[PDB]
Design an enzyme around this catalytic site. Structure first.
Site, short mmCIF file in Angstrom:
data_model
loop_
_atom_site.label_atom_id
_atom_site.label_comp_id
_atom_site.label_asym_id
_atom_site.label_seq_id
_atom_site.Cartn_x
_atom_site.Cartn_y
_atom_site.Cartn_z
N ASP A 42 0.83 -1.21 0.00
CA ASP A 42 0.00 0.00 0.00
C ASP A 42 0.87 1.26 0.00
O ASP A 42 2.09 1.19 -0.02
CB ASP A 42 -0.98 -0.01 1.20
CG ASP A 42 -0.28 0.16 2.53
OD1 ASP A 42 0.96 0.28 2.56
OD2 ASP A 42 -0.98 0.17 3.58
N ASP A 44 1.28 4.42 2.49
CA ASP A 44 0.94 4.94 3.81
C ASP A 44 1.19 6.44 3.85
O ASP A 44 2.27 6.90 3.47
CB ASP A 44 1.77 4.24 4.87
CG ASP A 44 1.56 2.76 4.86
OD1 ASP A 44 0.44 2.31 5.19
OD2 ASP A 44 2.53 2.05 4.50
N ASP A 84 -3.36 4.20 2.86
CA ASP A 84 -3.63 4.01 4.28
C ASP A 84 -3.28 5.32 5.00
O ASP A 84 -2.11 5.68 5.07
CB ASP A 84 -2.81 2.84 4.79
CG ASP A 84 -3.25 2.36 6.16
OD1 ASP A 84 -3.89 1.31 6.24
OD2 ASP A 84 -2.97 3.04 7.16
N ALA A 98 -0.66 11.02 16.85
CA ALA A 98 -1.08 10.68 18.20
C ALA A 98 -0.24 9.50 18.77
O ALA A 98 0.00 8.52 18.07
CB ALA A 98 -2.56 10.33 18.24
#
Ligand SMILES: NC[C@H]1O[C@H](O[C@H]2[C@H](O)[C@@H](O[C@H]3O[C@H](CO)[C@@H](O)[C@H](N)[C@H]3OP(=O)(O)OC[C@H]3O[C@@H](n4cnc5c(N)ncnc54)[C@H](O)[C@@H]3O)[C@H](N)C[C@@H]2N)[C@H](N)C[C@@H]1O
Ligand SMILES: [Mn+2]
Ligand SMILES: [Mn+2]
Length: 174
Positions: A42, A44, A84, A98
């Site tokens: 993918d 990211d 993603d 976070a």
């Protein structure tokens, strides 16, 4: 080259909007190395959380769509390629993912993909996600491609620094 072409198009559209985006995961490793090391399942991305609508707009303009809402962000698709996407939030002097180490989203473009400078997550942020991965999935059940990419990231950051970061991760989630 499909993936690289898509990365370049996404970042071009973002640059046009003065929208910072950080390449993450395997492409971030390859960007910081300045070499393509293997096939990546993918793409990211980390995006400013408060400008999510702008990233969705880019996805749509490129003919894609949001596919799934995730615990940590969202999944989008453009053609057969998966994006993603995780938000980062303004913390006085930088955007930060976070729960991640400070400096996760550096302002400077510190990697290169096929001659193009790119913003990418820090080595510490990259390795931090392997620590999570190790808790969520036992390492001897990891696919080999992640065993190898982890070792590569560790060699790039340095074993001394990785050891300290891992200890900090353990302490955080003690
Ligand atoms: N910043 C807080 C969050 O940090 C982590 O979340 C990662 C998330 O796992 C990661 O996505 C990986 O995990 C998802 C399942 O949760 C998969 O669906 C994604 N394809 C996968 O991205 P992908 O396969 O591209 O791997 C990206 C990186 O992540 C780690 N990883 C590699 N494979 C896994 C896996 N199966 N489960 C958990 N972590 C995984 C490795 O360190 C890898 O370098 C996101 N791309 C970045 C995000 N920061 C913690 N797992 C959850 C936590 O809430
Ligand atoms: Mn994967
Ligand atoms: Mn990936």
């Amino acid at each position: 080259t499909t993936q690289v072409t898509l990365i370049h198009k996404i970042l071009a559209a973002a640059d046009e909007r003065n929208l910072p985006l950080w390449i993450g995961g395997g492409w971030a490793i390859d960007a910081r190395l300045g070499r393509v090391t293997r096939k990546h399942d993918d793409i990211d991305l980390t995006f400013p959380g408060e400008r999510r609508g702008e990233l969705e707009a880019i996805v749509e303009m490129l003919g894609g769509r949001v596919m799934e809402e995730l615990d940590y962000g969202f999944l989008a698709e453009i053609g057969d390629e998966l994006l993603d996407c995780e938000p980062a939030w303004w913390a006085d002097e930088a955007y930060e993912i976070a729960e991640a180490p400070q400096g996760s989203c550096p302002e400077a473009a510190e990697g290169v993909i096929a001659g193009r400078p790119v913003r990418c997550n820090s080595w510490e942020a990259i390795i931090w996600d392997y620590f999570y991965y190790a808790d969520e999935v036992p390492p001897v059940d990891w696919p080999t491609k992640h065993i190898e990419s982890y070792r590569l990231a560790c060699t790039s950051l340095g074993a001394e620094k990785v050891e300290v970061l891992r200890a900090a991760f353990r302490s955080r989630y003690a």
